[PDB]
Design a protein around this ligand. Sequence first.
Ligand SMILES: CC(=O)Nc1cc(NC(=O)c2ccc3c(c2)c(-c2ccc(N)cc2C)nn3C)ccc1C
Length: 113
Amino acid sequence: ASVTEQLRHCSEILKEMLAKKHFSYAWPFYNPVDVNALGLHNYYDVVKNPMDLGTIKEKMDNQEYKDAYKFAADVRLMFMNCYKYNPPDHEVVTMARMLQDVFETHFSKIPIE
Ligand SMILES: CC(=O)Nc1cc(NC(=O)c2ccc3c(c2)c(-c2ccc(N)cc2C)nn3C)ccc1C
C-alpha cells in the first residue's frame, strides 16, 4: 500500500463516481451547484467551502492530492455541504447518499489512517 497505489485507487473511485451507470443520481454533483439557475440564494450563507466532482477531478488530474485521505476529505466535504444545506428528506439528499454509498464501498479498500 504505497501512496502511489492508494492514489491510483482513488483515481479509480473518482472514475466510478463519474461513470455512466451512476449519472441518474450523480449529475447534481458534477459541477458547482448552479445557485443562479436554481435561485438558491442563501446557499453561500450556509456553505462556505463549496466542492463538486469536477473540482475534485481537476485537482486529481493536476496531481494535487498528496494521499488518499486528502482526497477522501474533499469528497466527504462535497457530501457534507449537501447534508448541511438541504432538508434531510430532500431528493438531492437521497441522490447524494446513493453516490456516497458508491464512494464508501470502494474507499473501504484503502488502509486506515
Ligand atoms: C438553508 C435552505 O434553504 N435549505 C433548503 C434547501 C432546499 N434545496 C432545494 O430546493 C434544491 C433543489 C434542487 C437542487 C438542489 C437543492 C441542489 C444542491 C444544493 C446544495 C448542495 N450542497 C448540493 C446540491 C445537489 N441541487 N439541485 C439540482 C430546499 C429547501 C430548503 C429549506
